[PDB]
Amino acid sequence: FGVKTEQEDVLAKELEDVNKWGLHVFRIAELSGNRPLTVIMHTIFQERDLLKTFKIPVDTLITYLMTLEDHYHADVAYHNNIHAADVVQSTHVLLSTPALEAVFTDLEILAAIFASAIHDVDHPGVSNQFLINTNSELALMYNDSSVLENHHLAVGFKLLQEENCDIFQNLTKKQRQSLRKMVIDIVLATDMSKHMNLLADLKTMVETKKVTSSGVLLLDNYSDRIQVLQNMVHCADLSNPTKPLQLYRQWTDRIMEEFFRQGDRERERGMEISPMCDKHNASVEKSQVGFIDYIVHPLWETWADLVHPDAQDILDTLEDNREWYQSTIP
Ligand SMILES: COc1ccc(C2=NNC(=O)C2(C)C)cc1OC1CCCC1
Ligand SMILES: [Mg+2]
Numbered sequence: 001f002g003v004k005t006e007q008e009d010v011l012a013k014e015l016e017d018v019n020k021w022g023l024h025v026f027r028i029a030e031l032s033g034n035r036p037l038t039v040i041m042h043t044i045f046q047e048r049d050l051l052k053t054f055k056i057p058v059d060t061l062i063t064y065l066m067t068l069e070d071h072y073h074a075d076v077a078y079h080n081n082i083h084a085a086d087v088v089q090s091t092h093v094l095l096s097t098p099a100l101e102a103v104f105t106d107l108e109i110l111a112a113i114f115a116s117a118i119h120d121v122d123h124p125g126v127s128n129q130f131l132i133n134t135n136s137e138l139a140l141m142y143n144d145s146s147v148l149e150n151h152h153l154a155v156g157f158k159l160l161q162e163e164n165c166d167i168f169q170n171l172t173k174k175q176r177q178s179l180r181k182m183v184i185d186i187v188l189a190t191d192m193s194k195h196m197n198l199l200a201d202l203k204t205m206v207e208t209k210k211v212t213s214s215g216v217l218l219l220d221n222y223s224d225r226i227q228v229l230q231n232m233v234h235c236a237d238l239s240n241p242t243k244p245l246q247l248y249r250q251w252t253d254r255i256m257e258e259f260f261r262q263g264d265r266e267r268e269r270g271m272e273i274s275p276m277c278d279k280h281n282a283s284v285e286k287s288q289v290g291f292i293d294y295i296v297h298p299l300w301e302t303w304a305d306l307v308h309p310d311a312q313d314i315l316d317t318l319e320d321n322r323e324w325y326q327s328t329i330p
């Protein structure tokens, strides 16, 4: 008939949480038959009316989403389609923050969400440094500079050239040039080597923050608009510790699996084992507390100031999760 399977019904009930921090993204991956990026991107595009606004044929959208999801590696524990789906949905919730209501154009919203979806595509489950130290083809292609992030962009864009995959076929050249620049600026900013400069600029922006009447953020130049979108997708990328603990612990298991596999590949080859990649010499709990204290909490504390007090529950969850990991240090 033209009615859904019962599995498709349970999935649609889970997707009702799509506007909430703490979406059961792992369950959505189970119910979608490992299609969390495709169903969550589709739901978000419908909810934000992006198909109508950008004249995206729904068949082209689904073909591109499935092609893009297929170029995430199912055998990589963290940097997979589920992480991509998570960052997309998290970016979606951050865009909906009251303090940013009516700030960003449809093109900017599209850029942030599209960027989120492609931001780790074809990730091999090892670091830029590993790819450089092994003389990998990727490191050679990109002159050791933001190797993975250049690759994710190039793959994300290249997949638009596959059969019925050009979701931007109806955008004008002007819209396409603008969207392209914003997507490149956002994904290059996911390289952790850029974290300190991004955070410095976000702090500068909190100190010189102007609001409109009704208390929404004023951003009147490209440089300020893009820096907020960059920090937003960066916050989405580093949002695992800010999620309900049952989600956070699953992300911790997965990043540690990926890191230990890198360490095993380094030990095998007699390379120096990278920080927190040695399964024989690792404090999972102390590593998470260090991650929160030095990287995640400073970023989210500065985000929370920018959009005060929209992010208070997210920051409270981060601080609760931090105390939980601290209390399990043996
Ligand atoms: C859920 O714990 C994490 C989640 C993500 C990340 C990262 N995101 N990508 C990146 O480039 C890094 C900074 C490695 C790092 C996480 O824990 C760190 C602390 C224990 C291992 C790494
Ligand atoms: Mg990345």
Ligand SMILES: [Zn+2]
Residues within 6 Å of the ligand: 083, 087, 119, 120, 190, 237
């Ligand atoms: Zn990522």
